[PDB]
């Protein structure tokens, strides 16, 4: 349970730092 | 650039959690 | 400002991370 | 082992997010 909720939120950390990046470009 | 490297990183990160949860 | 947040959040996933390691 | 040295990286990729913060700001 609790690494498989990790592993999610590190996915939605993932597709969040891809948008601030394109924020940067 | 650097941020879409540590995206890619975490995502990685995230696969091999998921392994482990399994072990546990 | 949101990444300030995002690094706080992976130190609190670090800390818990260490914890589920012990155990396992 | 294996989950210390995630957690490790972890806060390596926080402390670069907090440089990458600083150069944005």
């Given at each position: 349970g609790e690494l498989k909720a990790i592993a999610q939120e590190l996915k939605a950390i993932?597709?969040?730092?891809?948008?601030i990046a394109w924020e940067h470009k």
């Open positions: 993932a597709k969040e730092l891809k948008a």
